[PDB]
Amino acid sequence: AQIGPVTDLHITNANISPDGFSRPAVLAGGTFPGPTIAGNTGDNFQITVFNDLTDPSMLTDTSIHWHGLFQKGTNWADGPAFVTQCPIITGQSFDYNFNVPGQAGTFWYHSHLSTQYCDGLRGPFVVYDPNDPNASLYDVDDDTTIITLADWYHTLAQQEPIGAAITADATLINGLGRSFTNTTASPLSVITVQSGKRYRMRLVSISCDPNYLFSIDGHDMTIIEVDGVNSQQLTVDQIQIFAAQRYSFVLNANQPVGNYWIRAQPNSGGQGFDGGINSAILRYEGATVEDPTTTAPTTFSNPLVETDLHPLADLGVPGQPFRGGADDPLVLNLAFANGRFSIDGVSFVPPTVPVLLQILSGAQNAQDLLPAGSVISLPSNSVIEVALPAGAAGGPHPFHLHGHNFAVVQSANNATPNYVNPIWRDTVSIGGTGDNVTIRFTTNNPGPWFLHCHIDWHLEAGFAIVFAEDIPDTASANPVPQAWSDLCPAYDQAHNIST
Ligand SMILES: *[C@@H]1O[C@H](CO)[C@@H](O[C@@H]2O[C@H](CO)[C@@H](O[C@@H]3O[C@H](CO)[C@@H](O)[C@H](O)[C@@H]3O)[C@H](O)[C@H]2NC(C)=O)[C@H](O)[C@H]1NC(C)=O
Ligand SMILES: *[C@@H]1O[C@H](CO)[C@@H](O[C@@H]2O[C@H](CO)[C@@H](O[C@@H]3O[C@H](CO)[C@@H](O)[C@H](O)[C@@H]3O)[C@H](O)[C@H]2NC(C)=O)[C@H](O)[C@H]1NC(C)=O
Ligand SMILES: [Cu+2]
Ligand SMILES: [Cu+2]
Ligand SMILES: [Cu+2]
Ligand code: NA
What we know:
The chain is mainly beta. The protein has 3 domains: 1-133, Immunoglobulin-like (Sandwich); 134-313, Cupredoxins -  blue copper proteins (Immunoglobulin-like, Sandwich); 314-499, Sandwich (Immunoglobulin-like), CATH 2.60.40. It has helices at residues 355-360, 456-460, 471-477, 482-485, 487-495, and strands spanning 6-16, 23-28, 37-40, 44-51, 64-67, 93-99, 105-111, 122-128, 146-152, 170-173, 190-193, 198-205, 212-216, 221-226, 229-236, 239-241, 246-252, 259-266, 279-284, 328-331, 334-337, 340-343, 375-378, 383-387, 398-401, 406-410, 424-425, 427-429, 438-442, 447-453, 464-469. The strands form 7 sheets. It has a 6-stranded mixed beta sheet with strand order 10-9-12-17-14-15, with no helix packed on it. A 5-stranded mixed beta sheet has the order 11-19-18-13-16, with no helix packed on it. The protein has a 5-stranded mixed beta sheet with strand order 20-24-29-26-27, with no helix packed on it. The protein binds a molecule of 3 linked components (NAG-NAG-BMA) (2 copies), copper (II) ion (3 copies) and sodium ion (NA). Residues 11-131, 144-287, 349-470 form the Plastocyanin-like domain.
């Protein structure tokens, strides 16, 4: 069952064995992935998060981010630790009380403390549209049509060396999959369809690192949503999905009744499908209960290319149709050396006082804010352009902006910008050496918004900056509840920190 929009959510430690290997984890709702949180567009969500964690090897503090939800007027509820809040301590709870006006689509929730979401705190978050403009394109859209893709590690996250190339031990599809080494024939996930029906498959990358080449043998996939943004219909036979991205696609159950492999090939870790790694099963009602015998093609003839995507609505692009054609045109210098990432020469290390609390306490320019050099102010009601030229080791880096979605004016592997009709999204691969992936948005959401690589090991190694959007209006725009004001005193007391 789905939970929400008003619900408790307990965060616990437990042993799990999603690939046959037992390890302890950090779980929401007792499962991996966590339960789907759901509601309708414009609903009030009140997710009361109970921190019941006791195992220090995965951190006993926590904080949860609602990925892709704008949090307008509720920056305090966004979740990134030491940007919008201090962590919730064990034995305490906290009500994330916000609204989702003007958004409907496929989202997710995850820990936003250190690398803790890798240890298991990740689940789907769906905002349905009762008047969805795509409703007539499918028959079925429910918890059974959500498909999660996850990396899974046998080593606990707090034992992963900072700045290292960290590699997973299994791909999990809907929480199940097989280990790349010492492979055992542990259970695979089954997605069940009825011959002749059409399904809104909500594909969610809950990855901490790898991108996946996702396909379904015998089937193609008609994309209708990208990171919450409705798209024109685009039919593909393979989707390369980067960490934290989401797609809805229509699956037409139009092949013979049977069993078909579902494939998710990561860019690192185990390559291929031997022993049923990187796999799940599409089963038609009436098929024999047995593994598929289908194969993949040698090459995919209609892969997703990001410049093929276009919004369903006439979203356009803000600003002027050339590079630098914005009120505030930025170019970030994105680098890596010696185990640490940097943006504009500064490696991100979380501050002791969350950025939002520094601003509410009166710090009002970005040079007054800590960490020094990690906070860039943005002017209000202005068109922002951010060029993100690639080259830093560990690519391709999927960059994500909190508080906003953005027009993808230039995509990976294509030097031509699009000022007319590019897709809008919230997480974008910045590509490879010599690329110049560039995003645009308008500043109508006061508050400090994190910008970072969504490979969680890279964020931990410093690949982030904070956009302090409209510092002067942050306090009036974001009134804070007493429980939020109580978080830093409690956290600092529990940890013997002075502030
Ligand atoms: C990606 O696109 C951005 C624009 O969106 C390019 O930025 C431009 O970068 C050049 C230098 O690479 C800038 O010109 C230089 O400016 C300084 C003075 O500020 C001057 O001293 C140098 O002689 C040179 O003129 C230009 O200002 C800039 N545009 C913006 C908005 O900052 C960037 O080069 C592209 N990167 C790649 C790898 O293609
Ligand atoms: C590289 O990225 C560029 C920019 O996103 C892509 O260029 C765009 O290509 C599309 C598809 O061909 C062009 O749209 C077409 O326009 C014609 C004329 O209006 C129309 O009859 C077609 O039905 C379609 O709308 C679009 O104009 C063009 N934009 C620009 C700025 O060049 C390009 O396709 C990408 N390269 C690859 C290999 O995918
Ligand atoms: Cu995220
Ligand atoms: Cu986010
Ligand atoms: Cu990265
Ligand atoms: Na425009």
